[PDB]
Amino acid sequence: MFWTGWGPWERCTAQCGGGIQARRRICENGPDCAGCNVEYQSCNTNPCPELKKTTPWTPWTPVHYEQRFRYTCKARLADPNLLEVGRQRIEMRYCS
Amino acid sequence: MFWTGWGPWERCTAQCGGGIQARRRICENGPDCAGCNVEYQSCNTNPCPELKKTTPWTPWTPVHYEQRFRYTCKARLADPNLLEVGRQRIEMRYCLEVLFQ
Ligand SMILES: O=S(=O)(O)OC[C@H]1O[C@@](COS(=O)(=O)O)(O[C@H]2O[C@H](COS(=O)(=O)O)[C@@H](OS(=O)(=O)O)[C@H](OS(=O)(=O)O)[C@H]2OS(=O)(=O)O)[C@@H](OS(=O)(=O)O)[C@@H]1OS(=O)(=O)O
Ligand SMILES: *[C@H]1O[C@H](CO)[C@@H](O)[C@H](O)[C@@H]1O
Ligand SMILES: *[C@H]1O[C@H](CO)[C@@H](O)[C@H](O)[C@@H]1O
Ligand SMILES: *[C@H]1O[C@H](CO)[C@@H](O)[C@H](O)[C@@H]1O
Ligand SMILES: *[C@H]1O[C@H](CO)[C@@H](O)[C@H](O)[C@@H]1O
């Protein structure tokens, strides 16, 4: 019974923000070797970048002068497709 | 050589999307026990929830009737503090073909 050399680290689960890498070795000719077949380490500890997506422009409205508004969504993510902007919601009221 | 009882799984590394929990044990009266002092299992494999944050309302503007608009930001995250709404950006501006034969 002998322990083989440690294998290469696997792929990190997360590209950023914290992931785990696993390294494996094989015990030969026995089910009970002294040591461990699997080790785990931290990987990709760099903070995820901040993705910014701008909302569609508000319809032009009078203040003559006209103005329109927009907002930005900010999120710390690895995939830009995970951040999305929802539908435009409009609220109305009457003033006399 | 003797293995102690398994310890608690401790805290999962990730709150959602996949994490690992580790439980530890101690080898007694020996430096070479058959087995491992630590075991790892999967935890919190459920996909992360979609967090929604609404933007501040635009100032009321006439169409009398008044109307205002707002948007919502949706993101798959574990911490709501990681999702934020940015600053309000405003664009401003000021406000016939005669055919004489
Ligand atoms: O030096 S500062 O005090 O200005 O800080 C700059 C960093 O602040 C953020 C996030 O705010 S914080 O969490 O309070 O730190 O953003 C804000 O400032 C930038 C403008 O920087 S500038 O040098 O004055 O040009 C704005 O970017 S921009 O859209 O105007 O182009 C941010 O506007 S936005 O809402 O993100 O669209 C503004 O955000 S906020 O109104 O305070 O919430 C960091 O931006 S972040 O990385 O997107 O969060 C700035 O860091 S950076 O490296 O300078 O971009
Ligand atoms: C494997 O583990 C260590 C060496 O890495 C020793 O306890 C022994 O060689 C075992 O087979
Ligand atoms: C792997 O771990 C270390 C090297 O990183 C040594 O104890 C030995 O090479 C083992 O196979
Ligand atoms: C501990 O691991 C197992 C028992 O859980 C055996 O290989 C042996 O008792 C070892 O000390
Ligand atoms: C470890 O595994 C379980 C507890 O997690 C039990 O079979 C026993 O305590 C063992 O040592």
Residue numbers in the entry:
A (entry chain A): 654 to 716, 724 to 756
B (entry chain B): 654 to 716, 724 to 755, 768 to 773
How is this structure described in the published paper?
TSRs are a unique feature of Sema5s and enable interactions with heparan sulfate (HS) and chondroitin sulfate (CS) glycosaminoglycan (GAG) chains linked to the protein core of proteoglycans. We determined four Sema5ATSR3-4 crystal structures to high resolution (1.56–2.72 Å); apo state and complexes with nitrate, sulfate, and the heparin disaccharide mimetic sucrose octasulfate (SOS).
The novel architecture of TSR4 supports two symmetrically positioned ~20 × 20 Å-sized shallow cavities on the opposing sides of the Sema5A dimer. Positively charged and polar residues (K505, T732, K734, R747, R749) from both monomers contribute to each of these sites, together providing a notable positive electrostatic surface potential. Co-crystallization with SOS also resulted in this heparin surrogate occupying one of these sites in the Sema5ATSR3-4 dimer forming multiple electrostatic and polar interactions with the protein.
